[PDB]
């Protein structure tokens, strides 16, 4: 019945939620359901949401355990073939939902696009093992995933208050969920937290892929691949742990091509 469900978590969003909804409702070539999951907004948010056509829009209004619990509630009730998550201060660009529908018609499970943030493209990485030593490879709000993808991977892990999006995409990579990256802007991400908290979660996510890593080693790899830190110890880390996991060797050789000759040795010794 619906090609797309858009889940919109809202909290005190009266300034932007109208623009957000208009960017979904104007999408051509698709049948769309909207599920607004509101976190208890005491402002005009509810009034503004109810000003739009209500036929294919549901508001879920109940207590939550943070934004990812709200997202999970919406994903669980989605009826659309492909499911997107759009923040209440984000907007989709024109014709994006038709692109998702067309590429999903061929059976692809995740369709993701580019993200515009403060006038610059998000520095995306590829969906591949090298992402498993980093964060989420594309912006989460530029991602659409099928009903089957959500069934296979599961829901967002509420232990991660910030990086549950990355942890979900990493689970998808590890489960071989299919993904198409489209090189056009799908979302303009609104920009209106303690960085140490973000770092701690990001390192924990990486350790969930590679549990042999110390926290400081996960941090070194993340900073290396993102271009935030040095890379002179990568070969040492590869020799320390290459025996543990062929996937780890593959991730480092993809992320740091300069260690290809050392990665070839790890494959030769153990894999």
Q: Which residues bind Cl ion (CB under 5 A)?
A: 126-127, 181-183
Give me the least distance between CB of 25 and Cl ion, in Å please: 26
Closest CB to Cl ion among residues 109, 266: 109
Closest CB to Cl ion among residues 78, 132: 132
Using the Cα atoms of residue 177, residue 183, residue 184 and residue 189 in order, give the sign of their dihedral: positive
Give me the least distance between CB of 186 and Cl ion, in Å please: 11
Closest CB to Cl ion among residues 186, 189: 186
d(CA 209, CA 229): 21
d(CA 271, CA 264): 10
Q: Is 89 exposed, middle or buried (0-12, 13-18, 19+ CB in 10 A)?
A: middle
Q: Specify whether the CB–CB gap between 193 and 66 falls below 8 A.
A: no
Closest CB to Cl ion among residues 15, 181: 181
Give me the least distance between CB of 126 and Cl ion, in Å please: 4
Closest CB to Cl ion among residues 12, 180: 180
Give me the least distance between CB of 198 and Cl ion, in Å please: 22
Give me the least distance between CB of 80 and Cl ion, in Å please: 23
Give me the least distance between CB of 128 and Cl ion, in Å please: 7
d(CA 169, CA 111): 12
Closest CB to Cl ion among residues 88, 143: 143
Facing residues of 189 across strands? 117
Q: Is 106 exposed, middle or buried (0-12, 13-18, 19+ CB in 10 A)?
A: exposed
């Amino acid at each position: 019945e619906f090609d797309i469900t858009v889940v919109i978590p809202t909290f005190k969003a009266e300034k932007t939620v109208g623009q957000c909804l208009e960017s979904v409702l104007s999408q051509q070539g698709v049948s769309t359901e909207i599920i607004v999951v509101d976190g208890g907004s005491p402002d005009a948010t509810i009034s503004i949401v109810q000003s739009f056509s209500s036929t294919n829009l549901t508001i879920i209004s109940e207590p939550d355990r943070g934004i990812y619990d709200a997202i999970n509630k919406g994903v669980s009730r989605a009826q659309g073939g492909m499911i997107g998550v759009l923040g209440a201060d984000d907007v989709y660009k024109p014709n994006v939902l038709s692109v998702v529908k067309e590429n999903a018609s061929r059976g692809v499970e995740i369709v993701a696009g580019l993200t515009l943030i403060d006038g610059q493209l998000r520095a995306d990485e590829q969906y591949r093992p090298a992402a498993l030593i980093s964060g989420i490879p594309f912006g989460h709000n530029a991602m659409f995933a099928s009903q089957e993808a959500y069934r296979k991977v599961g829901l967002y892990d509420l232990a991660y208050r910030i990086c549950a999006d990355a942890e979900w995409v990493h689970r998808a990579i590890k489960s071989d969920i299919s993904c198409r990256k489209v090189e056009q802007v799908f979302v303009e991400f609104g920009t209106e937290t303690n960085p140490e908290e973000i770092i701690a979660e990001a390192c924990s996510v990486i350790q969930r892929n590679f549990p042999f890593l110390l926290k400081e080693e996960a941090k070194y790899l993340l900073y290396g691949v993102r271009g935030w830190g040095e890379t002179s110890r990568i070969e040492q880390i590869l020799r320390k742990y290459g025996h543990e996991s062929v996937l780890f060797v593959t991730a480092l050789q993809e992320a740091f091509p300069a260690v290809e000759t050392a990665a070839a040795l790890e494959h030769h010794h153990h894999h």
